[PDB]
Amino acid sequence: ETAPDYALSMHGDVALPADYTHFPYTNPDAPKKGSLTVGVVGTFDSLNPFVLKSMRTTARGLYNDGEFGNMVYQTLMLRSRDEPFTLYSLLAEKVAIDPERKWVEFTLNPKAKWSDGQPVTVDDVLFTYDILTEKGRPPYNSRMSRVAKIEKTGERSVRFTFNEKSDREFPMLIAGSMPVLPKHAINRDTFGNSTLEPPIGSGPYVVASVQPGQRIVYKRNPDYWGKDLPSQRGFNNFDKISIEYYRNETSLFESFKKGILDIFIEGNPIRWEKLYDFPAVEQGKVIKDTFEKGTPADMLGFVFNTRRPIFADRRVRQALGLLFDFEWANSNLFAGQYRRTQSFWEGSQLSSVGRPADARERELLAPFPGAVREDVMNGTWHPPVTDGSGHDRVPAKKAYDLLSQAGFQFKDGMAIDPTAKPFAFEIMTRSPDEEKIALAYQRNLSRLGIAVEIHTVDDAQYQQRLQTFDYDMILGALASSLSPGNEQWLRWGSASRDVQGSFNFAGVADPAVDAMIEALLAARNRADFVSAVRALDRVLISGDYYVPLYHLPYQWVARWDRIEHPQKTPLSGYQLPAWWHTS
């Protein structure tokens, strides 16, 4: 009775009422003529995103695409990019669901059609779970291990009943992380092969041409079945989208400058600052756009391997963390473009930084009295801000005092560890960019008498060492989101510390961490969830497992002025599928 029939939200929060006319970040009257040409670094030679063969060389744009979403293969429900985790109607016109999430039932829209004009049916859905289970790659072949029964319940209705291996997130994955495939158009015996035959989907774009290693051209189907859905209003505005493939970023950038590519998505701060001094920018023909987003910025940090005795003591990790001089690095290496990262959910509502712990967090954390530092609990903690000099005496004195409390001596002019050895460790780096930042950190550590070796290892040997946790310190990245879930166990869970190949690079094993992961998974409403995640953040910060580095505070997209976008930018940042070509 309480469940909407037109939406499915992970934690029950649904921003749009049933009669919405469009997602709030689209222009409901966007022009519909003209093309978009974008570049990517890499290659492709196949057109099946759901199978092992050629999985690393599959064309962009078909399904699960970061910039373009699902242009050929569609899901039952469509994710809004203005909410943390809410899905709205797409192939499924209606949804019904068990309060306890033991079953979910979808009713297909009777207008739904494949691009060849055949109907999308319940039989296509059943076929989809059959063939992907038998012949798909992970994760697409793993869904049925959670499903007790899949059955047709009406002319256009299908119900999934789940088994005890399922969890509250699982129905979300059925609704939004599986395609629907066309039974009538797929040769089952060859499904799985590398293929360059244009595949049939229900999406708005068809594959018009394919030049392997070079270019895929999508054309809009004028008879696209979903064109009038409120969930599609102001999307799919380009009548043609070409994705071109380049061997490196410089080649790609040059092709943008020549007007062959319409946009350039920029992540390099030196390039953004220095290299957009070409005439088109000065004439206003190329616009440097910036956007903000409320999804978190991915963590980048130095990672302490807490398994090594040198780094077992959190007080030592805390001291060494204070010595990184971000303000010097930003100013001298990065043209001031970065902002300091402080939280594992940086820039989002899930960050604990600058927020006193709420009543729910304090309840959750009370059984773990040592787990969160007072400054972190009260929201007064931040990493040091230096004078930018590269030799600021203030964080260094705090570091010196902490190491002394932890048993260090200083005897000229070395830092001596509690076992009476001169303190020394290695930073394993993978690239010249990593070396450059490690070198900067090394200069500050050396000023306290600490000897640091920087050792660059090629990619394959680097991964061999990651696998066995064979390092003192590395640089580590995390793919963050507004919906942390089961993946948190392999990052931070105490069982993952001793599993070779896990993602727990710091070797975290703390019942408080485990308990906060349990709590965020148990949360059934967005308030409890936010509280639990913040509490996880507080514990992780208080362990000094990472020395958090930096992130870009704006998204950057340069564009020829023949490309436009809505004034509004949603929670997830810019959304290319809502952009259009000027008249």
Give the interface with Cl ion as residue ranges (CB under 5 A).
480-481, 484
| Least distance CB 350 / Cl ion (angstroms) | 8
Q: Take residue 1 and report the two structure tokens written for it.
A: 């009775």
524 alpha-carbon distance from chain centroid: 22
CA dihedral sign, ordered 438, 443, 444, 450 = positive
Contact (Cβ atoms closer than 8 angstroms) between residue 544 and residue 334: no
Q: Take residue 468 and report the two structure tokens written for it.
A: 């066995």
| Least distance CB 85 / Cl ion (angstroms) | 12
| Least distance CB 534 / Cl ion (angstroms) | 13
Which strands form 35-41's sheet, in the order they lie side by side? 35-41, 240-246, 215-220, 205-211
| Least distance CB 207 / Cl ion (angstroms) | 33
Any idea of the CA torsion for 104, 108, 114, 119, to the nearest 10 degrees?
130
Query: From residue 549, how far is each of 219, 437, 444, 484, 558 by CA, in Å?
Result: 42, 10, 15, 21, 26
User: Mapped to the 3 state alphabet, what secondary structure does 538-567 carry?
Assistant: HHHHHCCCEEECEECCCEEEEEECCEECCC
Contact (Cβ atoms closer than 8 angstroms) between residue 280 and residue 257: yes
| Least distance CB 349 / Cl ion (angstroms) | 13
| Least distance CB 341 / Cl ion (angstroms) | 13
Query: From residue 208, how far is each of 216, 217, 224, 366 by CA, in Å?
Result: 8, 6, 15, 60
Contact (Cβ atoms closer than 8 angstroms) between residue 227 and residue 204: yes
Q: Give whichever of 204 and 484 is closer to Cl ion, judged by the CB atom.
A: 484
Q: Give whichever of 4 and 484 is closer to Cl ion, judged by the CB atom.
A: 484
| SS3 state at 193 | coil
- Partners of 301 in the beta sheet? 476, 548
| Least distance CB 396 / Cl ion (angstroms) | 33
| SS3 state at 253 | helix
Q: Give whichever of 37 and 504 is closer to Cl ion, judged by the CB atom.
A: 504
| Least distance CB 307 / Cl ion (angstroms) | 23
Q: Give whichever of 83 and 93 is closer to Cl ion, judged by the CB atom.
A: 83
Q: Give whichever of 480 and 575 is closer to Cl ion, judged by the CB atom.
A: 480
Q: Give whichever of 268 and 481 is closer to Cl ion, judged by the CB atom.
A: 481
| Least distance CB 484 / Cl ion (angstroms) | 4
| Least distance CB 481 / Cl ion (angstroms) | 5
Q: Give whichever of 86 and 488 is closer to Cl ion, judged by the CB atom.
A: 488
Q: Give whichever of 134 and 487 is closer to Cl ion, judged by the CB atom.
A: 487
Write the DSSP assignment of 276-338 as a string of letters.
--SHHHHTTSEEEEEE--SSPPPEEEEEE-TTSGGG--HHHHHHHHHT--HHHHHHHHSTT--
Between CA 238 and CA 32 the distance in angstroms is 6
Contact (Cβ atoms closer than 8 angstroms) between residue 39 and residue 261: yes
Which H/E stretch holds residue 41? strand 35-41
| Least distance CB 487 / Cl ion (angstroms) | 7
Q: Give whichever of 76 and 299 is closer to Cl ion, judged by the CB atom.
A: 299
Q: Look-up: residue for tokens 């009038």?
A: 228
Q: Give whichever of 74 and 480 is closer to Cl ion, judged by the CB atom.
A: 480
Q: Give whichever of 40 and 490 is closer to Cl ion, judged by the CB atom.
A: 490
Q: Give whichever of 203 and 484 is closer to Cl ion, judged by the CB atom.
A: 484
| Least distance CB 480 / Cl ion (angstroms) | 4
62 secondary structure, DSSP code: S
Would you report the helix, strand and coil content of the chain in percent, each value rounded to 5?
Answer: 30, 20, 50
